[PDB]
Amino acid sequence: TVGGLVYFSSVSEYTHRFVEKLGLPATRIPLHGRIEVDEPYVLILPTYGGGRATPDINHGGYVPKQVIAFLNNEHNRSLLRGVIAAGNTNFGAEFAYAGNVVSRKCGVPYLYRFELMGTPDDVEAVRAGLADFWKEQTCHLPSQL
């Protein structure tokens, strides 16, 4: 069984580069237009909209508009199981804040955060963490009595 993975990456392609390094297959949310997915997934997304030294989870701009639109589709949203976020620690209290926003507002675990295209340690930690994450779903199977 392949873990479900969905990501967004802008013209700078840093999240795309991270996903390529992961060695796990993934579906990219496009710059424009609707897509749909069919099986449970973890979302990897970068953070935009920074600037506010004392930020608030509800202030808009952190989550890419294409991700908001993707998650407005009830079926896509129903299949979201967790989030991994990227950013730049120079943003301080706003570092990787899209992960905070998605995890709190969609009620899913915040699995990991990283900077830019990620380090080798980030790649390894995400590969191991995703494996452990999907294994934990096997603790939730229906009764077969």
Ligand X SMILES: Cc1cc2nc3c(=O)[nH]c(=O)nc-3n(C[C@H](O)[C@H](O)[C@H](O)COP(=O)(O)O)c2cc1C
- Quote the longest CA-to-CA distance of the chain: 55
Q: Cite the beta strand spans of the chain per DSSP E.
A: 5-7, 27-28, 41-46, 80-87, 110-115
**Cβ partners under 8 Å of residue 143, min gap 6:** none
Reduce the secondary structure of 52-67 to three states and give it as a string.
CCCCCCCCCCCCCHHH
Rule CB under 6 A: choose which of 27, 28, 69, 88 binds ligand X.
Answer: 88
Stretch of 68-76, 93-101, 124-132, 134-142 contacting ligand X, by CB under 6 A: 93-101
**Cβ partners under 8 Å of residue 112, min gap 6:** 84, 85, 122, 125, 126, 129
94 binds ligand X (CB under 6 A): yes
Residues 95-124 that bind ligand X (CB under 6 A): 95-97, 116
Residues 5-44 that bind ligand X (CB under 6 A): 9-10, 12-16
**Shortest distance (Å) from residue 115 CB to ligand X:** 7
Q: Which of residues 4 and 50 has its CB atom nearest to ligand X in the complex?
A: 50
**Shortest distance (Å) from residue 130 CB to ligand X:** 18
- Where along the sequence are the contacts to ligand X (CB under 6 A)? 9-10, 12-16, 46-50, 62, 86-88, 91, 94-97, 116
